Design a protein around this ligand. Structure first.
Ligand SMILES: Cc1cc2nc3c(=O)[nH]c(=O)nc-3n(C[C@H](O)[C@H](O)[C@H](O)COP(=O)(O)O)c2cc1C
Ligand code: F3S
Length: 1475
């Protein structure tokens, strides 16, 4: 979406504003979507004041007296087209408008031209009329709106696509529609009438993820335009909706509150809900600014910019207790009519530029150069940093973030006033009972306890799902974490922790609406915090999570009573309920059985909501059965406000208090571990894991994660879910309350009846004979390895093990159901033809040895399929076909590979763009048939790539242009894609640089993917890939391998269905992967919707992986996942083996096509109707699964056209196309020419100069060019200005630019300069957006102006001078030189790992702001430092003329003093930070 406002303070309403408002929506067009029409838009809208002049003519014609401005009041109404129904509708409006003592002067029909709508939108178009109203008592502004608010909310109970009130006020009005942006005024004629005039205007261009427009969903709402995604929606709604009965305020009546009855609702969009909630806060006596701060509060902690403002620190501390944040990225834009303004999500994930004149004429919006003021008169040119609002007030005043927040700091204050004032070894079998296992403690509790970080592992989740396994499992295991993919970003929990919190509030949440004067650091609480708390504010009835045996028979009863006990106890005054499994002291064999802590905490939490009582108390779960990071997050997820994991804490006590352990600590394990540390490590590890999990979804506060239920269950059933976990999806439906009972029995049996010596080991993490099954055993793989190596008996073995297995994934419950006669292999398409559909899938060069990696590329190239470069860059040497190959199978260009032919190439068909941008270079991008945006990977969705330092050889360091020793943890988000439009932009950058390349977007299966893919389709992508949780990794958290992401059967299916329903299916190719190792696997993926099929681990195995499982170690005994030369030498494995492997899989595909009866995989894809549920299978845990989700897909027997895709989507006529169209092809082809050109830019002009860069890149790679093409530009530049700039390319910006300047820049220069006619201070005024220089790789950027956040985010070699910045300055920087000449927001060094930066922060406040995890603040001390800093600060001036530049430069000897230099422990010893 795009958004803004325009305000005029010092004038009376004019038309120009309206005019400008509309022009501005024009420039939002790329931030918006269109329907299947390619024409109707996802929405476009405009809020203004009442065009009291225009309405004047209605009154005249009717011979009627026009009421006072404060007393007129106007409904913009969408009504049924059908006459009879439109009168029923009209009669209702009036029925209720009359029910508040109001009077209807009548209706105005709204002049429209339906002829410009696109066929879809026109088909759907409601009939639009404005109702004009008054109060005979004499009501006014506030009171009238108050009544009108009540009115619209009542009419809202009948809301329908045909029947919706867009706005009903005496102050503002909304014209909005399913039109494309510049069509708005074309459609609504009122907006092109010179009688239309307003002081302000909010505008909004929407971007939806479907193709079926609903007029109400267009969007400036009744009160705000909202651009973003509430990632916490379910929680926020659930809390908000429990407030609903006890609403209570100043003289608002109890029946007037019961009138807004449901002020929020799961079925509406985050935005309709936000607007609603925000509305309620305003109508009950707060200004839009304040209420925003209540619901979408800043991150206030550690903010040195609130030194002088302890008011607002306190007014957040207060509310932080009352109301959880509506998280997710968000630019809000609102007007009361009285006030109008904008503010950002806590994290500042959307752009927001403002512009101000001498006459306080203000202009905010997602983009800089949009409403065209006369620059000679701009006074400020600002932006909102994360948290900031900016506002206007009718009494002619702008209002910057600070006065602002102070103004509700001043009032209702009590802030910092009312705040202040507020022994055996039974353990070894308790442990069994509560479900502990040999591995749970050895592999998880211990590592947390000893190293203080949850364990790391490799490879994918090999074993079957909880509901299909035969081994016992917790209830926790049935819940997979959901995470952010395109729709919204993850945040970095380590680099950006400063923004989060695990605080939790034990008080009962009172009244939001009344600020009356009348707290857990972390959710984990020790036996100490627990004693402490059980004193606390209130007493705290234990409810037995326990129950006896026989007679009071089932877990069904025990649950029931617990709820009743719980309900009953809360009624009787209890403000905290510790649910224990340890009531009155002890756990027995007669206390025979538990309510699993997750199942209880859901029950009491939902049942209480149904009781209308949750806001009353708050929940502590006091349990044994909770030790693992995930465990904790289920709990907080479904209710728990805090956890005392009394047994986990206990299992650490016993471990450290043990001879074996105590002994090793004297030599072997770290005897730097007093029991106080072993425990302080155990929790500090639990905390880092919570932080992590939240971040996977972009969530800052456990307070927000709390109600919200950020999971998708798999194998829970219909009633089980409704009872305990209401509103969580389980599209597969298994476990009954009985069945969960039966499971807890399975390991209740084994601590009690029997005997206790060591908890059992079930091969969960690591293959074992006795234990859980694994698709990839060291044995299956040696047998497959020897099979490929020949050219049989190993397939016997090999397939054998693959028969031998139980159910493992959902495709196993399925089977074929042919609909045509069997056929002969000889009719079927050839092995050669199928093999083109295969992909080897993208494992990084770091992760794998170059031997292993280059080999896959060769076999894949041979088959005419594709392999994939992972996130590691690619060695340039690879882009060349081999001649040097000789008789022995060796070749000088790649001396470490074997069995090469002479047509061979090791260049990767697919080239990956991941969050770290590691190799991402103009020629990189250009050697590449396809380009992949890695949104996420199956082993670890919310997270980002991970490369232990051990593995960063110099080679890897060279390829990644990063530092030899140093660990590489890439950022969770791409700093580039904070939203769907953002995605759309990156695709366009890519199509822009290599128009020839297809662009894929790689997602992980999880509920919601279908909706995301719809958007990706609309964002012009060429291929979507669905990865399952199955997938492999060279290193991930173990919790993640076992807990994040759903199965690809759910992914592909959903993507396939939603795209078909949305009519986008033809737009896009579907690649599926995750645990595919077999013809049958491919066929199942095909039936399910996939057209291409990916293989990681088996390609690996086929090259010689055993399944050691030590990838993260650098030890592959076998040369595959190491960088160690010794081990690499052991690499057996030749392209021919991976070639032959793929030919097997193919062959097996041909035979399946034969039993099914079709000639070609093309004929099969999507024919889900060829699947039936299998006759043999029975599970151990439940009677069956529901498989509607896999079987009910769109018929595909006839409609097969979606299977024909255009070769490559295009960016359209683009400015670069003209540039590349004159006398330039000379400066290029004659390797050495100068060329100057000059052009006007408007901010539709995106990615400028990038395609020229590609054109040069393609002919002389990164460095072959000695030309001097200069392109000077003027105006406001679009996203990605100068991206991937080469040497020999210089770009001039007379003007300003937007986000991502110099994204990917490789070489050359970019110079940006306000326009001379400015009269403002450059250094004091913004000139560039967020994420400039992103993964810069060389080149130089100079800019007189501030820049926004993440300046030089992942800079590897780029140099720059700017004059101020937002937060996250130099975020994951790694090399190069950044010079900043003005203030700079906080977190200034997060994970920066090499390179030098020099600030100059004269408020002197810099070290309070800096991130201290790694970089060090020095004062320039070494001369060559000076010399480095000068020539830069000088260059800037020679390219620019900077005033602050020239200043320092002539008083070189003064500013140079306190003026800090940032040194990563790595440039520590270099001629510029030492001597
Ligand atoms: C050792 C290893 C390293 C991987 N590295 C990456 C990575 O660099 N980027 C990425 O998108 N996927 C990576 N993957 C996942 C693959 O892209 C692919 O999706 C996955 O291997 C398919 O699952 P499968 O192993 O079951 O066949 C890696 C997988 C493994 C086995
Ligand atoms: S499991 Fe990994 S540790 Fe080596 S054996 Fe396979 S590459």
């Amino acid at each position: 979406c795009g958004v803004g406002f325009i305000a005029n303070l010092r004038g009376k309403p004019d038309h120009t504003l309206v005019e400008q408002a509309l022009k501005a929506l024009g420039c939002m067009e790329h931030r918006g979507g269109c329907s299947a029409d390619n024409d109707s838009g996802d929405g476009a809208g405009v809020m203004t004041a009442i065009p009291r002049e225009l309405l004047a003519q209605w009154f005249n014609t009717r011979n009627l007296p026009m009421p006072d401005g404060d007393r007129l009041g106007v409904g913009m109404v969408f009504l049924p087209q059908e006459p009879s129904a439109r009168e029923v509708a009209r009669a209702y409006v009036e029925e209720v408008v009359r029910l508040e003592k109001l009077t209807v002067l009548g209706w105005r029909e709204v002049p429209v031209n339906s002829d410009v709508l696109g066929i879809q939108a026109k088909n759907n178009q409601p009939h639009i009329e404005q109702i004009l109203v008054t109060c005979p008592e004499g009501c006014a502004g506030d009171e009238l709106d108050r009544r009108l608010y009540i009115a619209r909310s009542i009419i809202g109970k009948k809301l329908a696509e045909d029947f919706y009130v867009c706005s009903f006020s005496c102050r503002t009005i909304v014209y909005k529609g399913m039109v494309r942006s510049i069509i708005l005024g074309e459609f609504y004629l009122d907006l092109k009438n010179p009688g239309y005039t307003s002081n302000f205007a909010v505008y909004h261009r929407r971007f939806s993820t479907n193709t079926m427009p609903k007029w109400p969903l267009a969007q400036p709402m009744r009160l705000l335009g909202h651009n973003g995604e509430i990632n916490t929606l379910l929680g926020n709604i659930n809390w908000m909706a429990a407030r609903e009965k006890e609403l209570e305020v100043s003289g608002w009546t109890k029946a007037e509150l019961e009138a807004l009855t449901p002020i929020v609702n799961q079925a509406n969009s985050d935005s309709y809900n936000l607007d609603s909630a925000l509305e309620l806060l305003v109508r009950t006596g707060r200004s839009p600014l304040e209420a925003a701060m209540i619901l979408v509060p800043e991150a206030y902690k550690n903010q040195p910019a609130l030194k002088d403002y302890p008011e607002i620190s306190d007014f957040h501390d207060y509310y932080s207790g009352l109301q959880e944040p509506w998280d997710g990225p968000a630019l809000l834009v609102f007007s009361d009519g009285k006030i109008v303004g904008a503010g950002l999500d806590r994290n500042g994930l959307r752009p927001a530029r403002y512009c101000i004149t001498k006459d306080d004429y203000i202009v905010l919006g997602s983009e800089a150069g949009v409403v065209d003021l006369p620059e000679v008169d701009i006074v400020e040119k600002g932006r909102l940093a994360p948290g900031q609002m900016i506002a206007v007030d009718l009494a002619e005043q702008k209002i910057l973030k600070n006065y602002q927040i102070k103004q509700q700091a001043a009032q209702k204050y009590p802030y910092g006033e009312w705040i202040k004032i507020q022994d055996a070894q039974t353990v070894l079998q308790q442990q069994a009972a509560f479900g502990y296992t040999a591995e749970d403690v050895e592999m998880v509790v211990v590592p947390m306890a000893s190293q203080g970080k949850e364990p790391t592992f490799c490879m994918g989740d090999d074993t079957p799902l909880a509901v299909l396994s035969h081994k016992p499992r917790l209830l926790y295991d049935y819940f997979k974490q959901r995470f952010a993919q395109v729709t919204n970003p993850p945040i970095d929990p380590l680099r950006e922790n400063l923004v989060m919190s695990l605080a939790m509030f034990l008080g009962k949440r009172g009244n939001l609406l009344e600020p009356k004067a009348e707290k857990l650091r972390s959710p984990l609480v020790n036996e100490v915090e627990l004693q402490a708390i059980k004193t606390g504010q209130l007493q705290v009835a234990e409810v037995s999570t326990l129950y006896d045996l026989d007679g009071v028979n089932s877990l069904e009863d025990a649950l029931t009573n617990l709820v009743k006990t719980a309900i009953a106890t809360v009624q009787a005054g209890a403000e905290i309920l510790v649910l224990t499994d340890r009531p009155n002291g002890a756990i027995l064999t007669e206390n025979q059985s538990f309510i699993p802590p997750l199942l209880a905490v859901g029950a009491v939490h939902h049942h209480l909501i149904r009781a209308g009582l949750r806001l009353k108390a708050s929940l502590i779960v006091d349990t044994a059965q909770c030790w693992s990071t995930h465990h904790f997050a289920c709990l907080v997820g479904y209710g728990a406000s805090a956890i005392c994991p009394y047994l986990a804490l206990e299992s650490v006590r016993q471990w450290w208090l043990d001879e074996k352990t105590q002994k090793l600590m004297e030599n072997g394990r770290l005897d730097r571990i007093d029991l106080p540390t072993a425990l302080k490590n155990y929790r500090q590890s639990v905390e880092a894991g919570l932080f992590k999990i939240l971040s996977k979804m972009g969530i800052s506060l456990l307070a927000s994660y709390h109600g919200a239920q950020i999971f998708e269950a798999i194998g829970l059933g219909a009633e089980l879910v409704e009872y305990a976990f209401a509103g969580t999806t389980s599209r597969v439906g298994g476990l009954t309350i009985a069945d969960v009972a039966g499971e807890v029995m399975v390991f209740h049996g084994m601590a009690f009846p029997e005997m206790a010596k060591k908890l059992e080991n079930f091969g969960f993490v690591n293959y074992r004979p006795g234990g859980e099954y694994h698709m990839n055993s060291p044995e299956m793989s040696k047998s497959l390895h020897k099979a490929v190596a020949a050219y049989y008996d190993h397939y016997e073995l090999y397939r054998q093990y693959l028969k031998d297995r139980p159910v493992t994934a959902l495709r196993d419950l399925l089977d074929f159901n042919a609909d045509q006669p069997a056929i002969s292999l000889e009719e079927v398409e050839s092995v050669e033809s199928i093999v083109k559909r295969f992909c080897t899938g993208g494992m990084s060069l770091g992760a794998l040895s170059r031997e292993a990696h280059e080999t896959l590329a060769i076999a894949m190239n041979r088959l005419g399929a594709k392999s994939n470069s992972g996130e590691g860059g690619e060695d340039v040497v690879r882009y060349l076909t081999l001649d040097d190959v000789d008789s022995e199978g060796n070749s000088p260009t790649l001396p470490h590979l074997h069995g090469l032919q002479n047509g061979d190439t090791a260049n990767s068909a697919i080239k990956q763009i991941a969050s770290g941008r590691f190799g991402v270079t103009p020629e990189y991008l250009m050697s590449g048939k396809q380009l992949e945006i890695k949104m996420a990977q199956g082993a670890k969705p919310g997270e980002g790539g991970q490369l232990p330092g051990k593995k960063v050889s110099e080679y890897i360091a060279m390829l990644r242009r990063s530092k030899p020793g140093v660990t590489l943890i890439s950022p969770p988000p791409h700093h580039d894609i904070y939203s769907i439009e953002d995605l759309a932009q990156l695709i366009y950058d890519l199509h822009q640089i290599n128009p020839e390349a297809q662009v894929s977007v790689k997602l992980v299966a999880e509920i919601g993917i279908g909706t995301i893919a719809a958007g990706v389709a609309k964002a012009n992508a060429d291929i979507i890939q669905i990865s399952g949780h199955d997938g492999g990794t060279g290193a991930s958290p173990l919790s993640s391998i076992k807990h994040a992401g759903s199965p690809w059967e759910l992914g592909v299916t959903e993507v396939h269905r939603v795209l078909m329903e949305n009519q986008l299916r033809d737009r896009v190719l579907l690649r599926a992967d995750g645990g595919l190792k077999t013809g049958w696997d491919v066929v199942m993926a095909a039936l399910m919707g996939a057209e291409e099929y990916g293989f990681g681990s088996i390609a690996m195995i086929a090259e010689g992986c055993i399944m050691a499982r030590v990838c993260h170690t650098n030890n592959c005994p076998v040369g595959v996942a190491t960088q160690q030369e010794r081990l690499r030498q052991r690499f057996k494995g030749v392209p021919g083996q991976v070639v032959n492997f793929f030919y097997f899989i193919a062959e097996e595909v041909r035979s399946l096509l034969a039993h099914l009866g079709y000639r070609s995989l093309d004929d099969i894809i999507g024919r889900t109707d060829l699947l039936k549920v299998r006759s043999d299978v029975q599970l151990s845990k439940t009677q069956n699964l529901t498989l509607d989700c896999l079987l009910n897909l769109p018929d595909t027997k006839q409609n097969r056209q979606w299977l024909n895709h255009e070769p490559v989507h295009s960016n359209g006529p683009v400015l670069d196309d003209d540039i590349l169209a004159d006398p330039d092809i000379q400066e290029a082809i004659n390797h050495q020419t100068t060329a100057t050109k000059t052009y006007r830019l408007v901010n539709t002009d995106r990615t400028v100069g990038t395609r020229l860069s590609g054109a040069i890149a393609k002919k002389y790679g990164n460095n072959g060019f000695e030309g001097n093409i200069t392109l000077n530009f003027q105006g406001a530049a679009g996203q990605s200005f100068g991206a991937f700039n080469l040497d020999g390319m210089t770009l001039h910006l007379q003007g300003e630019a937007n986000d991502y300047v110099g994204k990917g820049m490789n070489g050359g220069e970019i110079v940006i300069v306000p326009h001379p006619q400015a009269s403002f201070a450059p250094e004091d005024n913004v000139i560039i957006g967020n994420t400039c220089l992103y993964g810069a790789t060389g080149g130089n950027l100079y800019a007189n102006g501030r820049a926004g956040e993440r300046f030089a985010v992942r800079n590897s070699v780029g140099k720059a001078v700017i004059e101020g910045a937002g937060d996250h300055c130099c975020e994951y920087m790694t090399g190069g030189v950044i010079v900043v000449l003005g203030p700079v927001g906080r977190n200034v060094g997060a994970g920066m790992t090499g390179g030098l930066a020099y600030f100059l922060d004269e408020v002197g406040d810099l070290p309070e702001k800096i991130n201290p995890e790694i970089i060090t603040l020095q004062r320039i001390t070494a001369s060559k430092g000076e010399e480095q800093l000068k020539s830069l600060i000088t260059a800037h001036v020679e390219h620019t003329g900077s005033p602050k530049g020239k200043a320092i430069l002539a008083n070189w000897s003064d500013y140079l003093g306190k003026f800090w230099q940032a040194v990563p422990p790595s440039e520590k010893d270099s001629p510029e930070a030492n001597n």
